[PDB]
């Protein structure tokens, strides 16, 4: 186990903070909120999204061919 | 008046009035004419051959779909 006071060494940093009863819990919730989640979404679409559409494409084509394999089967049997 | 009374205790059902009305629109007459084409087709060479379960089911899907859409408003 590790306690405060024995964690690590810190040089010259000041930290100002404020009482919760003195500030808002939702500063600019929407004003600053939305823009940021856009920003984080943007920042990550390209690594998260691609594999999922790949699965998405393989899922719809996969069931497609499953029905068209049997149902479509006949087809032609002419004599 | 009195003729409609015998009509009730002897006939009447909202399913058939709707079925026939649904058996009427585009996808149905088309799915029935794909079914009648095959109907004739296998009973044409009326001997030694395959099946036709398939063309019936596609007709019942298209019908029973729009059947479910309006049907329940008539019941009770």
């Amino acid at each position: 186990g590790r306690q405060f006071g024995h964690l690590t060494r810190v040089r010259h940093v000041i930290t100002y903070s404020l009482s919760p009863f003195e500030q808002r819990a939702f500063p600019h919730y929407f004003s600053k909120g939305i823009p940021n989640v856009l920003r984080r979404t943007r920042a990550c679409i390209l690594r998260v999204a691609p594999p999922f559409v790949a699965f998405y494409l393989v899922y719809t084509w996969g069931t497609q061919e499953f029905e068209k394999s049997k149902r479509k089967n006949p087809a032609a049997y002419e004599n | 008046p009195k003729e409609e009374e015998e009509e009730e205790e002897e006939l009447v059902d909202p399913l058939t009035t709707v079925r026939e009305q649904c058996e009427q629109l585009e996808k149905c007459v088309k799915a029935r004419e794909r079914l009648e084409l095959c109907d004739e087709r296998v009973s044409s060479r009326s001997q030694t051959e395959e099946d036709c379960t398939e063309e019936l089911l596609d007709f019942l899907h298209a019908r029973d779909h729009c059947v479910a859409h309006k049907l329940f408003n008539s019941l009770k």
């Binding site: 590790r2 699965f55 393989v58 899922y59 084509w61 061919e65 | -």
Partner: protein, 378 residues
């Protein structure tokens, strides 16, 4: 002097969630540890109330459950919370392991490893769990699976019949499973504490994989309330199922009692084993299929030996970040295939997904790591 620190008991509690220093930094992906805890107790808790009404005996098995659902005051919510909590316990277990790989948490060997032991046990538990109501899925689910040990060379047969109590699944098998389904969650609960013990030795990892010693915050306020909110969310979900969609994740045919004569062409283990199911049968081998099924999970214990990157979290690693999601989607693939019949498209694609899985974790991610090193000049 503050008794909250010197009392033999509180110490533990102070160390668990009061004074323990944690990263000012963790995010929602760290909640699933409380959620798994909550899951474990709630499961133990509804599970127990079902045991005051359940039975065992093949004759009454199914009958008792319905008795509960219909006759037992409120037996239905209890029964359904139990069955739905079971799924949630997997969603979280899944998410937890997920969080783990992405962020490199697995570098805590002992902790990670205890967690793998925690995975197999809740799997082993939940398996026995669904055999209990004695439904169709319960019977062949309990059959298709267990058998697998019959693939073990020379002694497979012996073991599968030893675990059975007969020559098939019956009398001896339901009581057995109930008892095991009863004692396991307690044992798990112990293991969890040891898991947590080893975790306190290093403290928590964080989204950057850097090291938060320079900025720790007290578990007091912070993570207790961020655990409460979190748990409320877990309640919302569990209740959404139970109260609006009770059987959405449940196979409708575990209704209708057993029958060693039948077997309903379909049958798959509960959703949470689908990916595994897919793997096993995506191999034309009794030995290979089960061997591959094992590796499918026991590979987690291999991950740390293939850490190749000079950074710990994937937070700054686009290449690996891509292979991570490819893994997830690919698991979502295996889950989907597992859910389908062994026919045309479905076979070859589930066969590809399997290879992908093993090739991705065993070759692709480890290489992505080295290339990133080289790119950074490390």
């Amino acid at each position: 002097t503050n008794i909250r620190k010197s009392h033999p008991l509180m110490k533990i509690v102070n160390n668990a969630f009061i004074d323990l220093p944690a990263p000012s930094n963790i995010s929602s992906w760290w909640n699933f540890g409380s959620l798994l805890g909550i899951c474990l107790i709630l499961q133990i808790l509804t599970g127990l109330f079902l045991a005051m009404h359940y039975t065992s005996d093949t004759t009454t098995a199914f009958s008792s459950v319905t008795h509960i659902c219909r006759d037992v005051n409120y037996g239905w919510i209890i029964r359904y919370m139990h069955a739905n909590g079971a799924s949630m316990f997997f969603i979280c277990l899944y998410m937890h392991v997920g969080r783990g790989l992405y962020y490199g948490s697995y570098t805590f060997l002992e902790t990670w490893n205890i967690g793998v032991i925690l995975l197999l046990t809740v799997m082993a538990t939940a398996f026995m769990g669904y055999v209990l109501p004695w439904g169709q899925m319960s019977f062949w689910g309990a059959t298709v699976i267990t058998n697998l040990l019959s693939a073990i060379p020379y002694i497979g047969t012996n073991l599968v019949e030893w675990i059975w109590g007969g020559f098939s699944v019956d009398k001896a098998t339901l009581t057995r499973f109930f008892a095991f389904h009863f004692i396991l969650p307690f044992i798990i609960m112990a293991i969890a504490m040891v898991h947590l013990l080893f975790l306190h030795e290093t403290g928590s990892n964080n989204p950057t994989g850097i090291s938060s010693d320079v900025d720790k915050i007290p578990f007091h306020p912070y993570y207790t309330i961020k655990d409460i909110l979190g748990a409320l969310l877990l309640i919302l979900a569990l209740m959404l199922l139970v109260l609006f969609a009770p059987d959405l994740l449940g196979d409708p045919d575990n209704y209708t009692p057993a029958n060693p004569l039948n077997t309903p062409p379909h049958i798959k283990p509960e959703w949470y084993f689908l990916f595994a199911y897919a793997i096993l049968r995506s191999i034309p081998n009794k030995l290979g299929g089960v061997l591959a099924l094992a590796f499918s999970i026991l590979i987690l214990a291999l991950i740390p030996l293939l850490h190749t990157s000079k950074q710990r979290s994937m937070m700054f690693r686009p290449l690996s970040q891509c292979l991570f999601w490819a893994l997830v989607a690919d698991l979502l693939t295996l889950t989907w295939i597992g859910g389908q019949p062994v026919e045309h498209p479905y076979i070859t694609i589930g066969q590809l997904a399997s290879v992908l899985y093993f090739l991705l974790i065993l070759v692709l991610m480890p290489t992505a790591g080295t290339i990133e090193n080289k790119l950074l000049k490390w």
